[model samples]
Target: VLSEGEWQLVLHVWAKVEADVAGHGQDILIRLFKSHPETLEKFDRFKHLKTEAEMKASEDLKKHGVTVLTALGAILKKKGHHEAELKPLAQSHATKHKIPIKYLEFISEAIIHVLHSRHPGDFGADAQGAMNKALELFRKDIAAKYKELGYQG
Candidate 1:
């Protein structure tokens, strides 16, 4: 669980990620695809984006990318303690989207990179630690939701 200090630090840095939601969110997805190319197959809309340039150039990618961060921000605003906002996303990713919960790791890495770089100096390792801890809890919630949905694989 996130201590109050951890949650506040995370939210302070997250404001930077929230600052460039469309740009950084899209960049995060592109970076995720770059590191784990096979994950690209999970998205019909993004799968067609074969090149980095194409990925950056597409509005669909931008829209969905922004949506991803917005959803995340909603959860972060609550310090990853509740799933009221995460339930529908968890259900869809498990049941319809066919997502592997493991991708959470990848996206978290992407978020760490984008968010860390965005802050000139304040986003230090401690802030990064808090971010990871927060994501860890979110992942726990996601995995539990997946099990509840009878997720396969």
Candidate 2:
């Protein structure tokens, strides 16, 4: 179970990702795809997605969105101060599919928007700070994962 603060932190992190996606952070979307290449096969209609919203609503996007949610859940379960679930998932997903991490980064950029809609508060300075912290945690997790696996870059 997660404490209220942990849950709030997760929400804020989720909001940050969503906001980034909505703002067209293509890099993050690509990252997500890199992490889960099976996402490509699952959402074969990405090319056919007409509107931006339609593209965002693609099955791959939804899958990634759920991944983000699961990430939060895992973070909560481990009572992790910083999100530790993302990297393992990233590593596991990458190892399982033999996909490059860069692709997952791209996918994350594409789907960040879905996370922002959770909180429409404009984020302000504090929220932005939290977002940055959450992102830093995410980055650290990825780096740590790579290091642990003896993989560089």
Top-TM-score candidate index: 1
Candidate 1: tens digits of C-alpha lDDT, residues 1-153: 789999999999878777778988888888999999988998877788889999889998899898889988899898755769989888888888888888878888888887777785988889989989998888888889899889833
Write down the TM-score of every candidate: 0.94, 0.50
Which runs of model 1 end up more than 4 angstroms from their true locations?
Answer: none
After superposition, which runs of candidate 2 have C-alpha atoms over 4 Å from their true positions? 1-60, 76-87, 98-118
TM-score between candidate 1 and the true structure: 0.94
Q: Write candidate 2's Cα lDDT for 1-153 as tens digits.
A: 334564466565554554544333333444444555555554444535444556455566556555555564455345346445566675765455444445445544443443444445654445545544454455556656666776533
Q: What is the Å distance of residue 31 in model 1 from its true position? A: 0.4
* Local accuracy by lDDT, each model: 0.85, 0.50
- Find the 10 residues in a row with the least total lDDT in model 2: 21-30
As for candidate 1, its clashing pairs are none
Residue 97 displacement (Å), model 2 = 3.8
